[PDB]
Tab-separated table of N, CA, C and O in Angstrom:
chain	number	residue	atom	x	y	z
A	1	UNK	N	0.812	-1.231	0.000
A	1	UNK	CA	0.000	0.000	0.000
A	1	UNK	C	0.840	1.274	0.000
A	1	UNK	O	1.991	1.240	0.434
A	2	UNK	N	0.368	2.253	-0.413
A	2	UNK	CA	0.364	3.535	-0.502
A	2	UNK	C	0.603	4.292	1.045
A	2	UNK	O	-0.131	4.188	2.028
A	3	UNK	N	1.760	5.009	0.925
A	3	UNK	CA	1.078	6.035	2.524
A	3	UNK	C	1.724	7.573	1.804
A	3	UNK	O	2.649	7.907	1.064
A	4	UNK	N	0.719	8.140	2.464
A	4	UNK	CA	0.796	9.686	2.756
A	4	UNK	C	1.152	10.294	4.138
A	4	UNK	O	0.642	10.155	5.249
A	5	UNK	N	2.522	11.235	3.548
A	5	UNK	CA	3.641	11.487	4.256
A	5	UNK	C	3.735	13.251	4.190
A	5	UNK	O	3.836	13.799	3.092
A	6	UNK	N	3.705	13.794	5.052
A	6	UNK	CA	4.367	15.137	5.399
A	6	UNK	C	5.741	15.288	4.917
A	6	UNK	O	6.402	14.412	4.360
A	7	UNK	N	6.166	16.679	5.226
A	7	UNK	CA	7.369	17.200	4.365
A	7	UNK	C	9.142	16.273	5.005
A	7	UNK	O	9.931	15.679	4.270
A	8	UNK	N	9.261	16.463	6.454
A	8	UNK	CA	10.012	15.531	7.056
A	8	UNK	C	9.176	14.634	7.315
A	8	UNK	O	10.051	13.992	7.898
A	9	UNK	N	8.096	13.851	7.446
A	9	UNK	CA	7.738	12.919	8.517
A	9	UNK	C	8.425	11.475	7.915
A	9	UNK	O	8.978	11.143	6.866
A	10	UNK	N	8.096	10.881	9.073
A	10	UNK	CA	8.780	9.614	8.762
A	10	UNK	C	7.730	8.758	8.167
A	10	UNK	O	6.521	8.619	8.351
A	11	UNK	N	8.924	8.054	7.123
A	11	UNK	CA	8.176	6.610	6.359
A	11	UNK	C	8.055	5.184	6.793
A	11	UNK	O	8.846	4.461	7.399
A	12	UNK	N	6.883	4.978	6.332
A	12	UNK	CA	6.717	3.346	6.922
A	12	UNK	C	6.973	2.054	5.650
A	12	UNK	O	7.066	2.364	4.462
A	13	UNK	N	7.049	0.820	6.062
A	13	UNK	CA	7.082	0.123	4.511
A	13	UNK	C	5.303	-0.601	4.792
A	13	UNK	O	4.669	-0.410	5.829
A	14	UNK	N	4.955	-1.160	3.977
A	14	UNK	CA	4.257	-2.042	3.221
A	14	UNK	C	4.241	-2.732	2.299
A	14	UNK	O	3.634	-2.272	1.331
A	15	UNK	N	4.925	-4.234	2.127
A	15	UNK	CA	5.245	-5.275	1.151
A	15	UNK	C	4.220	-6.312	0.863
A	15	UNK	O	3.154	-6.257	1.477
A	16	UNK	N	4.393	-7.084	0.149
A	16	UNK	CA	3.665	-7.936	-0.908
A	16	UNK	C	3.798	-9.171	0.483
A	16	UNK	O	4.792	-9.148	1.209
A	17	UNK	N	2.887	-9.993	0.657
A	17	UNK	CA	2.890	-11.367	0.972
A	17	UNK	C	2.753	-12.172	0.062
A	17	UNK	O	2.357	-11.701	-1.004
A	18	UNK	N	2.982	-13.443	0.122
A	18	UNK	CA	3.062	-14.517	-0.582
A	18	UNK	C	2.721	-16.456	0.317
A	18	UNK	O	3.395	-16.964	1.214
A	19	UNK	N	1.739	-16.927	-0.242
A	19	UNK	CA	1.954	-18.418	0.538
A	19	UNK	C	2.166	-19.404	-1.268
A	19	UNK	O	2.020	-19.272	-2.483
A	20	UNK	N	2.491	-20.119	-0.461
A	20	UNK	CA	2.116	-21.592	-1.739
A	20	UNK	C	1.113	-22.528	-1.554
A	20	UNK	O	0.766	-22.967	-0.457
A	21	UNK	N	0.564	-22.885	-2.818
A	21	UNK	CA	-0.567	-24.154	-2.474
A	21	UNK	C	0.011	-24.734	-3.387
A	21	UNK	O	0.778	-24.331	-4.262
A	22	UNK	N	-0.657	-26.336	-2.988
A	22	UNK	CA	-0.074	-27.577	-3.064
A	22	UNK	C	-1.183	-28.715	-3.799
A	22	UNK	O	-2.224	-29.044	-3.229
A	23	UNK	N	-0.693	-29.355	-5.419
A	23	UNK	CA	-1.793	-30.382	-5.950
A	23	UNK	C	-1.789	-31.456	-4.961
A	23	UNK	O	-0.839	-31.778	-4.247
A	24	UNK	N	-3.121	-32.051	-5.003
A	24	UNK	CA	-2.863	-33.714	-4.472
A	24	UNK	C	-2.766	-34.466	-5.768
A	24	UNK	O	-2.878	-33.937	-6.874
A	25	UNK	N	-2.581	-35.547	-5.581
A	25	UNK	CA	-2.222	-36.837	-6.672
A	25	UNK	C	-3.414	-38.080	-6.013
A	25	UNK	O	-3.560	-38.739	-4.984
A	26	UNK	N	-4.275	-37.837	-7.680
A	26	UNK	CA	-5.265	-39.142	-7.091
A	26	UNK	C	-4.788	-40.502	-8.633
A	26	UNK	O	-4.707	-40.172	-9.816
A	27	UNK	N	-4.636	-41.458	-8.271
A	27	UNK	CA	-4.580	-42.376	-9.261
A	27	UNK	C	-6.251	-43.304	-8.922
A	27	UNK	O	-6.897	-43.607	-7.919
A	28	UNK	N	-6.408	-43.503	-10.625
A	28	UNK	CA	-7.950	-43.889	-10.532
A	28	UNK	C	-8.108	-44.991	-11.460
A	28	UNK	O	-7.999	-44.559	-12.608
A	29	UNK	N	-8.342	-46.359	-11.425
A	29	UNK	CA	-8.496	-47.552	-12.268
A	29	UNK	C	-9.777	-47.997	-12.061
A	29	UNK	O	-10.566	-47.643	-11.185
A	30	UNK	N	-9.939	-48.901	-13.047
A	30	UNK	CA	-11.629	-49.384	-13.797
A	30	UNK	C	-10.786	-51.199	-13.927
A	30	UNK	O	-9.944	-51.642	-14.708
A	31	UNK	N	-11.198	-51.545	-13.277
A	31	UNK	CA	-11.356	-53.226	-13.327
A	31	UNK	C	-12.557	-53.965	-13.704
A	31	UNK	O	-13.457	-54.104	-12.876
A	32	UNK	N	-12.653	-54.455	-14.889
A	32	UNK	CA	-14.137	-55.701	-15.101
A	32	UNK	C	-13.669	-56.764	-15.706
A	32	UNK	O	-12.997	-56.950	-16.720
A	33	UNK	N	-14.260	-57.588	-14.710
A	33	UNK	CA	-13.633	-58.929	-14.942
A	33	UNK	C	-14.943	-59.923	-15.697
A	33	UNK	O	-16.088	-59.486	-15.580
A	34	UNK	N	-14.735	-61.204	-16.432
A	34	UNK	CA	-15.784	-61.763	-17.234
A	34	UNK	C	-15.285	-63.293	-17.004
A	34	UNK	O	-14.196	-63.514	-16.476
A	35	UNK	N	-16.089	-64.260	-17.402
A	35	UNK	CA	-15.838	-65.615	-17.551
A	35	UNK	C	-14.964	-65.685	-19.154
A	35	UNK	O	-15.213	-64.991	-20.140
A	36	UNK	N	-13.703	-66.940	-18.991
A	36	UNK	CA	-13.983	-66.849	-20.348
A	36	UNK	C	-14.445	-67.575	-21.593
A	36	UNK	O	-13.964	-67.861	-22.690
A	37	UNK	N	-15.775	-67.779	-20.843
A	37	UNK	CA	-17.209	-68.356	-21.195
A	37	UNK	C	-17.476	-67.594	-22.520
A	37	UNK	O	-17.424	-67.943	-23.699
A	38	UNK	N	-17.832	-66.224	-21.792
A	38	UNK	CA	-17.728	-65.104	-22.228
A	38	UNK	C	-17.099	-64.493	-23.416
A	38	UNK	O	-17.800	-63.979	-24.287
A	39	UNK	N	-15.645	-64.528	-23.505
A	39	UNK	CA	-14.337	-64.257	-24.590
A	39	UNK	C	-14.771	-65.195	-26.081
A	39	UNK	O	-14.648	-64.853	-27.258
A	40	UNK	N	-15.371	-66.621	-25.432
A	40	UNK	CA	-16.003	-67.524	-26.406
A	40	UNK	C	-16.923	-67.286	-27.434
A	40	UNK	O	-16.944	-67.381	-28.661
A	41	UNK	N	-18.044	-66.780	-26.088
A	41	UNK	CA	-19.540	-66.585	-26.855
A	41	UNK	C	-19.438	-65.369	-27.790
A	41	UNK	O	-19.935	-65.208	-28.904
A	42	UNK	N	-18.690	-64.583	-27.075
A	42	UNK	CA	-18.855	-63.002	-28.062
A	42	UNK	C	-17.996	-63.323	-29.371
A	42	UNK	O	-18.547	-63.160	-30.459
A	43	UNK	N	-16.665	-63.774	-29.320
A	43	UNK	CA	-15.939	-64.101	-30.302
A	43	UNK	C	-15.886	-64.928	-31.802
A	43	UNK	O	-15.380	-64.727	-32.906
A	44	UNK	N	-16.783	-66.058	-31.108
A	44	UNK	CA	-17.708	-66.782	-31.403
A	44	UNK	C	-18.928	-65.771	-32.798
A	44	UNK	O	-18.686	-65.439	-33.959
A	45	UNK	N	-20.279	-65.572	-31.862
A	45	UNK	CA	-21.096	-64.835	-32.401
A	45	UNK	C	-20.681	-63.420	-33.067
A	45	UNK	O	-20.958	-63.072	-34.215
A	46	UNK	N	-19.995	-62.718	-32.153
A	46	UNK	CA	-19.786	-61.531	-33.194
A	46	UNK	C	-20.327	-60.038	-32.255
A	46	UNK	O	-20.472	-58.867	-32.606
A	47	UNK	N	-20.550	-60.848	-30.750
A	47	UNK	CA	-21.646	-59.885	-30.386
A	47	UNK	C	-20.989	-57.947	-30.015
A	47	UNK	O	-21.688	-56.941	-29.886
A	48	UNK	N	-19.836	-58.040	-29.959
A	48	UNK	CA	-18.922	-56.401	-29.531
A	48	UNK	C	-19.262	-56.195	-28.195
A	48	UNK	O	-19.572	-55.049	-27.873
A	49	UNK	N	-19.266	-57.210	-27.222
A	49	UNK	CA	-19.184	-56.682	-26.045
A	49	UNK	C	-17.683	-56.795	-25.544
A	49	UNK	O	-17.527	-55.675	-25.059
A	50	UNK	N	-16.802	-57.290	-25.414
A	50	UNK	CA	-15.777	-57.123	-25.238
A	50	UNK	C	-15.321	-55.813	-25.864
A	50	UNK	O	-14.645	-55.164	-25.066
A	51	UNK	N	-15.466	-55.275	-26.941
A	51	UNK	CA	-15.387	-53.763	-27.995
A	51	UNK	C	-16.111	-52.675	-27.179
A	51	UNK	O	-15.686	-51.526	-27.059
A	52	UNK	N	-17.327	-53.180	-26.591
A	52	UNK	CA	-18.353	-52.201	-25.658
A	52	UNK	C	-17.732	-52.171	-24.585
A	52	UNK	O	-18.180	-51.536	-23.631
B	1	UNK	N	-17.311	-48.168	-13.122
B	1	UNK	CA	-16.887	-47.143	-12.551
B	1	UNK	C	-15.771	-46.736	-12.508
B	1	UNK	O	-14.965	-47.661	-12.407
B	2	UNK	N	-15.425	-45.972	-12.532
B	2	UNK	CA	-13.728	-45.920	-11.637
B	2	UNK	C	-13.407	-45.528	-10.316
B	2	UNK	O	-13.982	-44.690	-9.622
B	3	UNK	N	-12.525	-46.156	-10.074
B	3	UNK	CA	-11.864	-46.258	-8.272
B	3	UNK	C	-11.277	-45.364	-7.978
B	3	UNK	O	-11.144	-44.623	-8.952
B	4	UNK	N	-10.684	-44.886	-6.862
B	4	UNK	CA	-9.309	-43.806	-6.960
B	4	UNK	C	-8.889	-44.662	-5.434
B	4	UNK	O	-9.538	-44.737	-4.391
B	5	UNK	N	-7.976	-45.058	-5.678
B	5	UNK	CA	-6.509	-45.874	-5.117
B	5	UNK	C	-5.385	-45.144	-4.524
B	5	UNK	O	-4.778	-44.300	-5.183
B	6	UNK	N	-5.007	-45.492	-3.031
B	6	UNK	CA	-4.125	-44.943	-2.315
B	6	UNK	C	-2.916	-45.533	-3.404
B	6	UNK	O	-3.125	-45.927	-4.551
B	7	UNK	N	-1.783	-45.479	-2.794
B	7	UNK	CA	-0.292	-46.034	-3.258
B	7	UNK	C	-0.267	-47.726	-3.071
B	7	UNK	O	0.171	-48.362	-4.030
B	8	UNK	N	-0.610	-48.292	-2.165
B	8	UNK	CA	-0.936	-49.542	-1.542
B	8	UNK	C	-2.446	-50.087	-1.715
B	8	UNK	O	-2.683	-51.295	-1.673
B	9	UNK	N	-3.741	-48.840	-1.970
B	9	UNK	CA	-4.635	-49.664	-1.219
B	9	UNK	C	-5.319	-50.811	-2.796
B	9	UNK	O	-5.220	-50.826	-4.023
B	10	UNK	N	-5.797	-51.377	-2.007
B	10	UNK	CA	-6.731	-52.289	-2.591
B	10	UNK	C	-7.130	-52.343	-3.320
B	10	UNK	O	-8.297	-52.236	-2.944
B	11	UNK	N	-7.173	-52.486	-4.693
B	11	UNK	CA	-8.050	-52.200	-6.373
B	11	UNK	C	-9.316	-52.997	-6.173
B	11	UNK	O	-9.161	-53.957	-5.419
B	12	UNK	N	-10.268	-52.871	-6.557
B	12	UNK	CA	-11.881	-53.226	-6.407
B	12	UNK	C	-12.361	-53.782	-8.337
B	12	UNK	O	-11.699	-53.524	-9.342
B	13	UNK	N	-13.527	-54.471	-8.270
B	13	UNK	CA	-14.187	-54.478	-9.789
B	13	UNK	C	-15.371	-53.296	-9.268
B	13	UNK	O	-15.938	-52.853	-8.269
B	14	UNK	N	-15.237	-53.118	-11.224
B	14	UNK	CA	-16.942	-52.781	-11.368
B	14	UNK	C	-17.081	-53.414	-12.953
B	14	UNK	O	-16.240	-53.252	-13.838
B	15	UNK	N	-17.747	-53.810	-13.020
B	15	UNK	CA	-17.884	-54.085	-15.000
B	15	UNK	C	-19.064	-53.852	-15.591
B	15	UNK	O	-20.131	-53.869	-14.977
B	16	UNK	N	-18.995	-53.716	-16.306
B	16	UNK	CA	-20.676	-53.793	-17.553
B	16	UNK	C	-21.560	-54.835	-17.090
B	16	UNK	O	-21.301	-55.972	-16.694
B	17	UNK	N	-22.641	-54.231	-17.216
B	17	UNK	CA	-23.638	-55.620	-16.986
B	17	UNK	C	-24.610	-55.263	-18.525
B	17	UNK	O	-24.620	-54.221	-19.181
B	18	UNK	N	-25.246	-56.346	-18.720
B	18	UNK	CA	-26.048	-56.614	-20.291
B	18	UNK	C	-27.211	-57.565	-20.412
B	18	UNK	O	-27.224	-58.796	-20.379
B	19	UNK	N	-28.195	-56.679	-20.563
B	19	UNK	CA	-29.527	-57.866	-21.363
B	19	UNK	C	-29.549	-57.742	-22.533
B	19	UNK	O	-29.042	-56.821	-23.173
B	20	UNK	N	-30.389	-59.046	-23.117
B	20	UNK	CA	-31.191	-59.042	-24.549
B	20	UNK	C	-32.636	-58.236	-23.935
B	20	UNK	O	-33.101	-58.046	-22.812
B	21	UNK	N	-33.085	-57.856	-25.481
B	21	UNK	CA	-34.760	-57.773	-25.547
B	21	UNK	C	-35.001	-57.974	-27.295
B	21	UNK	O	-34.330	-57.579	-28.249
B	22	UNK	N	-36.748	-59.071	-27.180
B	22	UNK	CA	-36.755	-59.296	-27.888
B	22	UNK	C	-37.867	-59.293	-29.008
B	22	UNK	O	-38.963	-59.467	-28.476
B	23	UNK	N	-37.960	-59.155	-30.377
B	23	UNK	CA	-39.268	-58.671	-31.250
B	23	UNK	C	-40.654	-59.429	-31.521
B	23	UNK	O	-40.636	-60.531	-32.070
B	24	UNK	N	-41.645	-58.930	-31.196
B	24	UNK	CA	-42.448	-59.797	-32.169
B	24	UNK	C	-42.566	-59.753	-33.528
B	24	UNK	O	-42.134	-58.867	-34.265
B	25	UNK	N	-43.200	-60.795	-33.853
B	25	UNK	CA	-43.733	-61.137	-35.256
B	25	UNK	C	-45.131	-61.009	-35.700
B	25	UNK	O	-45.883	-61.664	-34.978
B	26	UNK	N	-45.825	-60.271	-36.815
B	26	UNK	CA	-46.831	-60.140	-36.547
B	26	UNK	C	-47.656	-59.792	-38.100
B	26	UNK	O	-47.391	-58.704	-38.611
B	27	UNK	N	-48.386	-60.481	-38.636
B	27	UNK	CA	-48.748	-60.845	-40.233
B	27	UNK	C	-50.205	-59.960	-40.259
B	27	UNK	O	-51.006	-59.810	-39.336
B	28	UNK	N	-50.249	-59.522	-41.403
B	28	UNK	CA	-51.619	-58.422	-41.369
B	28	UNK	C	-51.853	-58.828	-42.824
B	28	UNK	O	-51.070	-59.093	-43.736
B	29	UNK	N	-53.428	-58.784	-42.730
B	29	UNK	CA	-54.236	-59.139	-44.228
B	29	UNK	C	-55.425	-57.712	-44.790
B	29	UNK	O	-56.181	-57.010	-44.118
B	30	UNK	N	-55.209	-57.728	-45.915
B	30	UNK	CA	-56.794	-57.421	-46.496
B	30	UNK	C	-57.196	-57.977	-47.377
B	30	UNK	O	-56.460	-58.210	-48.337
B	31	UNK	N	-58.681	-58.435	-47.347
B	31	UNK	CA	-59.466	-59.250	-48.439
B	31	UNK	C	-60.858	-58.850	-48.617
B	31	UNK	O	-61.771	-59.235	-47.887
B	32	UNK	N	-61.024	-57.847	-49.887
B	32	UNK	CA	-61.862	-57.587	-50.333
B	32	UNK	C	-62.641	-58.325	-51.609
B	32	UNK	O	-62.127	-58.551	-52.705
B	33	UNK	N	-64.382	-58.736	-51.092
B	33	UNK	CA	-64.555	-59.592	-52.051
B	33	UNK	C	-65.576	-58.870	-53.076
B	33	UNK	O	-66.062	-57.899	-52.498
B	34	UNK	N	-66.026	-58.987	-54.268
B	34	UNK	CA	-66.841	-58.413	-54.973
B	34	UNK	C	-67.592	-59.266	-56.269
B	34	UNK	O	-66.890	-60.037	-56.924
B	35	UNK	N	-68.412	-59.170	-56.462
B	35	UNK	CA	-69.500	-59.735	-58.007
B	35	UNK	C	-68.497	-59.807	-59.363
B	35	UNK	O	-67.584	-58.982	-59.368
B	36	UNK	N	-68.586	-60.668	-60.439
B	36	UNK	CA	-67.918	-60.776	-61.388
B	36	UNK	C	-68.836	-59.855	-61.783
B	36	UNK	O	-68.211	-59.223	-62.635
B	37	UNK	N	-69.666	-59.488	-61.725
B	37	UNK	CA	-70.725	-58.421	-62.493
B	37	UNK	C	-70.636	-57.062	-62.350
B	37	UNK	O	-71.129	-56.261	-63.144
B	38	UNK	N	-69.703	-56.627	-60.847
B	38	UNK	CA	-68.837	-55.412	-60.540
B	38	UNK	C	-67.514	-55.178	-61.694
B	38	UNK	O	-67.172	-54.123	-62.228
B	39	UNK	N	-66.824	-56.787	-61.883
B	39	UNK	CA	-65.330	-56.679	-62.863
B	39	UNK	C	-65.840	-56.451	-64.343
B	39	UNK	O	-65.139	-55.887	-65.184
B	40	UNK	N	-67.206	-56.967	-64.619
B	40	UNK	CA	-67.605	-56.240	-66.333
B	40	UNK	C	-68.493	-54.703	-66.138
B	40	UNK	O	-68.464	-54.019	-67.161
B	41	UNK	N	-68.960	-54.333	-65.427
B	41	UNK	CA	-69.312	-53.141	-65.313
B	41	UNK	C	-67.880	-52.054	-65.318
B	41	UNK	O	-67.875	-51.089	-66.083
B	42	UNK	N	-66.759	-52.319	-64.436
B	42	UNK	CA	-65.760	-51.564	-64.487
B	42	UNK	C	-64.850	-51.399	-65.334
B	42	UNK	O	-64.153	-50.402	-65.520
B	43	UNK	N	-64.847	-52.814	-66.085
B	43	UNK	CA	-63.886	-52.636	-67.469
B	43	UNK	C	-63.908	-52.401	-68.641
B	43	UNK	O	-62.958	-52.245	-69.409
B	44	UNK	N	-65.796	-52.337	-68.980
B	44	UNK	CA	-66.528	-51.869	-69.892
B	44	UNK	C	-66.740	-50.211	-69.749
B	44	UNK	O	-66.179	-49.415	-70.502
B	45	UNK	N	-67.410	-49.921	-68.940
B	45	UNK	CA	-67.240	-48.434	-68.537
B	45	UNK	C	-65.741	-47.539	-67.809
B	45	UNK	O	-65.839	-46.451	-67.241
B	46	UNK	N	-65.093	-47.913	-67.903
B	46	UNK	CA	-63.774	-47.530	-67.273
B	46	UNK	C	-64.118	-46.957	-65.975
B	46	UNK	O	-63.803	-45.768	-65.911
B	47	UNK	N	-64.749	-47.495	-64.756
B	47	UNK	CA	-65.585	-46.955	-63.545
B	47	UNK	C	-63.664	-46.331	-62.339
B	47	UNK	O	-63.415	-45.379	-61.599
B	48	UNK	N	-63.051	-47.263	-62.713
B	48	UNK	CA	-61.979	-47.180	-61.757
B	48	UNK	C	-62.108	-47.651	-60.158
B	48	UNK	O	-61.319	-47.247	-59.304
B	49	UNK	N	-63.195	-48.545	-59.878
B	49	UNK	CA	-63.410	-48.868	-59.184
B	49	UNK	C	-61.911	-50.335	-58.509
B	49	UNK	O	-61.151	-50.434	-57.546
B	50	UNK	N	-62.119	-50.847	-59.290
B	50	UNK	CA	-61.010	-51.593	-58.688
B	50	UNK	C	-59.415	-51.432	-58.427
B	50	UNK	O	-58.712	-52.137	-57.703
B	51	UNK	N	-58.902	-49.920	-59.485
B	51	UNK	CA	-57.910	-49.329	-59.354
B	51	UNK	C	-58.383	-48.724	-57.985
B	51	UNK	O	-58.456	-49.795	-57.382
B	52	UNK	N	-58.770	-47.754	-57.026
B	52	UNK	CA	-59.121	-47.663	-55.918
B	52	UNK	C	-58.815	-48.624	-55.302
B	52	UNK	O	-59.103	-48.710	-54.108
């Protein structure tokens, strides 16, 4: 900030502060598991669920 | 879904789930009957009755 000062008077300071902030770290996975009954029938037929 | 996982913790499932659904079948008629005496009236006079 700004100050207003007379002809001698004395000066004051006023400086800038500063903090830091900080990311967190999230790790995020998707697991689906199937028979592979499953890997058969679709592969097999044609059906695109394994693709879905 | 997806999870969000410490460094260590535990990984979990989620997966797709899936039905069929399925169509009917279903046969539709029209049968209109009329006089052979309607088919020489209309083809003698050009009535346009059976084009209709």
């Amino acid at each position: 900030r700004g100050e207003v000062v007379g002809e001698s008077a004395e000066k004051s300071e006023s400086t800038a502060t500063f903090a830091p902030v900080t990311s967190l770290v999230r790790k995020v996975q998707v697991t689906q598991r199937f028979s592979q009954e499953v890997k058969w029938a679709d592969e097999s037929r044609q059906l695109g669920v394994l693709q879905t």
